[PDB]
C-alpha cells in the first residue's frame, strides 16, 4: 500500500507543521522524503496528486495568513502582523521544498530553482504582498524617519519589507528590479529629503566647525543604518548609492562653505579640525584641491614674511635666516603629518611650496635707499 491515497494522510500533517513552523521530529522529516519517493515511484498519478495536494496545502495556509494580516485596518498594526507572518513564512520557504526534491525531479521544467519554493513565494505575493506593498513601504519609511528623530523600533519591521521586495520580484533578468525602483528609490528620496531640511538648519544654528562634526556623525549613522536596512547579500551597490546620496546632501551641498574655513584653520594650527575637513572633503570629487592651494599659499606667505624680516641683517647674520627657514619647514612638515597624515597629495603640495619659498628667497630684492 504505497499509493497517494495510502500515504497522503501521513504526509499532509507534516506539510502543515512545516508551513506553520511547528515542531517536526527527524523521523517525521526523513519519512516525508521516503513517502514522496514511494508515492512518485509506485502510483502512476503519484507526482500529479502530490503536486496538487501540496499546492492546496500551500494555498490554504496563505489564505489563513492573509486573513490574519488583512484583518488589521491600522497601517502600523498591518505592518506588525505582516512581519510576524513573513519572518516565519520566509524561513519555511528554505525548509518545506526540501522533502519535495524527489517530486520536483519528476516534473517538467526542472533553492532558487525550486518549483515548490517559487509556488510558496508567488502565492504569498498574489494574496498578501502585492495588495498592501505600497502601505508597507510607506510605513517602513516613516519608521526610518522616526528613528532619525530619536524613536527606537523593532528593526525587523523595516528588514522584512526590504526582504519582501528583494524576494517577491517577477523578472528573471532583473531579480532586484522592484527593490531598486520602489524600496531603494523611496529610501534614497526620504534620506535626501531629511538632510536637505536638517543640514542647512544645523549649519546656520551651529556654524561650520560644529557642522563638520555633525556631517561626519550623520555619515557614520547612515552607513550603519543602510548596512542593516538595505540589500547587502546580493552584492548590489545599494549602500554605496545611499552613501553617495548622503555625501552629496551633507558635504557636496556645503563644500564651498566648508573650504572657506581652511585658510583660517591652517593659520591657527587647528590640526584636529583640518583632519576632519580632509576626511569629509576627500569624499567629494576634487574636494582636496582647494585645501592643497590654501596650504601652498600659506607656506609661501610665511616664507616671504621671514625673508622680509631677515633681509636687513642678511649680510651679517644669514645663519639666523637659514635657521628660521629650517624652523618654518619643521613647523609645516609637522602640520602635514598631524592634520593630513602625510598624504602623498599633501606632501607633493608641501614640496612644491618649499621649492617656491627657496626660489622666491633667492630672487628676493631688499628695498633700496
Curated annotation (Swiss-Prot):
Belongs to the cullin family. Disulfide bonds: none annotated. Component of multiple cullin-5-RING E3 ubiquitin-protein ligase complexes (ECS complexes, also named CRL5 complexes) formed of CUL5, Elongin BC (ELOB and ELOC), RNF7/RBX2 and a variable SOCS box domain-containing protein as substrate-specific recognition component. CUL5-containing ECS complexes specifically contain RNF7/RBX2, and not RBX1, as catalytic subunit. Component of the ECS(ASB2) complex with the substrate recognition component ASB2. Component of the ECS(ASB6) complex with the substrate recognition component ASB6. Neddylated; which enhances the ubiquitination activity of ECS complexes and prevents binding of the inhibitor CAND1. Deneddylated via its interaction with the COP9 signalosome (CSN). The keyword Nucleus applies. The chain holds residues 12 to 386 of 780 of the full protein. The gene is Cul5. It comes from Mus musculus. It comes from the Eukaryota. Its main location: nucleus. GO terms for molecular function: ubiquitin ligase complex scaffold activity; ubiquitin protein ligase binding. It is found in: Nucleus. One of its GO terms (biological process) is reelin-mediated signaling pathway. Core component of multiple cullin-5-RING E3 ubiquitin-protein ligase complexes (ECS complexes, also named CRL5 complexes), which mediate the ubiquitination and subsequent proteasomal degradation of target proteins. Acts a scaffold protein that contributes to catalysis through positioning of the substrate and the ubiquitin-conjugating enzyme. The functional specificity of the E3 ubiquitin-protein ligase complex depends on the variable SOCS box-containing substrate recognition component. Keywords: Isopeptide bond, Nucleus, Phosphoprotein, Ubl conjugation, Ubl conjugation pathway. This is Cullin-5. The modification Phosphoserine is found at residue 23. Coiled coil: none annotated. The modification Phosphothreonine is found at residue 191. GO terms for cellular component: Cul5-RING ubiquitin ligase complex; cytosol; nucleus; site of DNA damage.
